[PDB]
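Thread: Modeling a multi-component assembly for a lab meeting

Hi all, long-time lurker, first post. My supervisor asked me to bring a structural picture of a complex we are working on to next week's group meeting, and I have zero experience with this. I have the sequence lines for every component (934 residues in total). Could someone generate the structure of the whole assembly? Inputs are pasted exactly as I received them:
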Amino acid sequence: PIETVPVKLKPGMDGPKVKQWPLTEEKIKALVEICTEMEKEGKISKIGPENPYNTPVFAIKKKDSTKWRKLVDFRELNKRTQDFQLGIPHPAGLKKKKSVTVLDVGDAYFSVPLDEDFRKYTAFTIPSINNETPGIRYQYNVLPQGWKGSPAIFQSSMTKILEPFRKQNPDIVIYQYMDDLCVGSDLEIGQHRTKIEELRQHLLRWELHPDKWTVQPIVLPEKDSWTVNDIQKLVGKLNWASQIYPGIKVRQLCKLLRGTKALTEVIPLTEEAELELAENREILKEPVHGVYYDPSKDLIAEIQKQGQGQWTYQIYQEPFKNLKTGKYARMRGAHTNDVKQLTEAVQKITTESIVIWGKTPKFKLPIQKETWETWWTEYWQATWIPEWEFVNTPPLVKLWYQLEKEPI
Amino acid sequence: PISPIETVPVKLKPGMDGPQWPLTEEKIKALVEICTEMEKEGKISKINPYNTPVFKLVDFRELNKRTQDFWEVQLGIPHPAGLKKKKSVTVLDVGDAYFSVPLDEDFRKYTAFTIPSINNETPGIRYQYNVLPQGWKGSPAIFQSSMTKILEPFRKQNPDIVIYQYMDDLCVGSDLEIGQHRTKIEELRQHLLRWGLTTPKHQKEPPFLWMGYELHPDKWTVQPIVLPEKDSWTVNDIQKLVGKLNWASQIYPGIKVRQLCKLLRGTKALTEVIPLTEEAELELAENREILKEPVHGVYYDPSKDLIAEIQKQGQGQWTYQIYQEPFKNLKTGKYARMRGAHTNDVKQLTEAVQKITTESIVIWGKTPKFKLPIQKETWETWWTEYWQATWIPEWEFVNTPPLVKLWYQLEKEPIVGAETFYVDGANRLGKAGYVTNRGRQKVVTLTDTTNQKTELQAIYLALQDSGLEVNIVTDSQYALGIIQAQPDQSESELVNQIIEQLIKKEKVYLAWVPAHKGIGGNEQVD
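Re: Modeling a multi-component assembly
Sure thing. I ran the full set together rather than chain by chain. Output:
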């Protein structure tokens, strides 16, 4: 119980009162077990009905988490917490690094008290199956993991804790987003992992490859003989691409299409169209010019389902002006689980959204809210949780980005 | 009467202030007598600028407006099938116990009210409560929480004794033997009495009234709610009838209300008397037979897992039944569906599963293993290709038709040899037709349409006038997606039309190209 800074909410705003979604028994178990300890360890303490706030609570199983980890959804709260200055700046370098490693340090926060006047808002509730009893509701006396105010207040101490290593190795970058720590260096496999360990040591005592993430290009089909359909489809994508590259020309082709021919019908290419493609192929070899990140604007991340386990995504702030584009292939075993793949993707994207810009993008998910809400947590493995909205993939956005590095 | 329980702090709504009708000499006398009593029992206290109108009844309507908000009392009710069969199950009615819980001294002030005098402008008698006031906002909310603590120890003391809280109710089950169980209820009552929580003289008994449900010992039956038979049916009446009728369709699979609903068409007032049609008299009668019949169910036995099997009562009409032992159902239900703007059965099958899955998780904290009307290839063929993230937990295919399947499947590539129809339609009336590669051609003038309809009809006709295999190229992105989503039911008749026709073919390849562009064929219709 050192001292607490008097944090408050953004003017006018009020504490979250979010529904506690339905939970599996086991999860409940874990939670309850978990929560009792923390209770007796003074971290948290039961509250009454006089506390009308609430935040969702789930339970997850990270990599080695063969036991359940408690996870809270302070997103709503986070949104209502007065901004902060003591907030960590973005070292535009870790992106350029050879390899990165993420570290869960939320634990750190428990050792720091939370203003007695704010605690009411951290209210969360453990529900009982079939409503046998009301839920078990607590509060936080310390800095809760998953809350923004935390890494902010525990900033002064995070520096102190790190400089002896930071100051030590300045050829390695350490970035802290929320509960996490992104650690990057160019040292080879063993030489990195070992240093990490040293770092783990330092902390107890108290992987990524951002280089290989190539924002993929678009590649047009290239058969030796062309059909009416073949053109038509091609032309369609090009006519679309024009929204990114206006130089894309589809005239010398739309010619090859006049007359009411069987789609199956074969058509020979004019040397102009022959060039027109050539010219379009070249325009497509590079990302549209004039794309710069605007930290003042929100980062949007859209995802399309290309099927057969494939998924494409584009992070952008202003439409057609992509900061990055990518494909993602389902994880081993995840076969029969669309939801898993998506939840996996999402993470792997918010991953880079952080490395690169040090902030989470708002997602546009091709899935039904009900479906997603029923199962994501079942495969979520992060301390953070981005923002989302569900959508209806336009058939063309999908057809185009399907054309990316649909490899060789 | 009174309790030694840690009162809870109550504040007024953010920056607000605390809140008498003239009465009969008779209503005064009566109300004064009541209060002197209510006073002595140690409940109220003579005394303050506030006042609430006493009618005995007290109108806190205003107080409550000015009272803070509490944690949501949770209007989510435990469902019989979620009860774990128990050797014994006593049920205590706690109810009046809230008048036993102390009120946050500070707050008490607001509760103030007045008792009229005959000679008005003569001090009537003023009071205020010292414990949770029936009618007050936080009462329920608070009393619960209190109880919860008062049990807590005890619930740990004896683990095999299972308790359920619910308003003025306290269902207590256990696997203890009769007298053995008996005595435990005895200790609980005391524990509660050791705090001011007094319990009955009129002890409740075994067949239980779970609003609608009849909770028996190790099973539950449905207390058949009857159909007010008469020969003078008001509107109100035929509605209320459909109300109970629908409630029924759930645990009684077979109830139908199509023709009873029809009776509602055009109605001009609630009191209107609508003569039932012949089909009305029949349906409404064949429904009196079902309802007579009683239905029993079992309870959750964690020892054996959960299983849910579903079926299609009609397009987008689903019936499910959850059970641990075959024919020994835990619960059953029906999902009459929306008839969305543009759906399909497999998708729909999916949403059925999804709710079940959630419903279960509440009731049991676990999700059921699924038995379903679909070939695994069908599922497979569909979900791996649909544009949307979709999923069904663990399941098995049950072959008890009608089976849900893919009414049709557009081709992946153009059909060779099959005919090709370049279609197009188009002002705030219109036209739409086609021109195949092999000569054929049409067009049609439409009176009263919109761009959409036309386009569609375009494609519609294209399908009318073609063989079992057709190649159709169009430029309506809207039409495209809709169809490319291969839906087997919609809001649009026209769309419905197309689906009909689509099904009709042996092979259909839809192609789409950008409009206005010089795209040949496309520029002819244009």
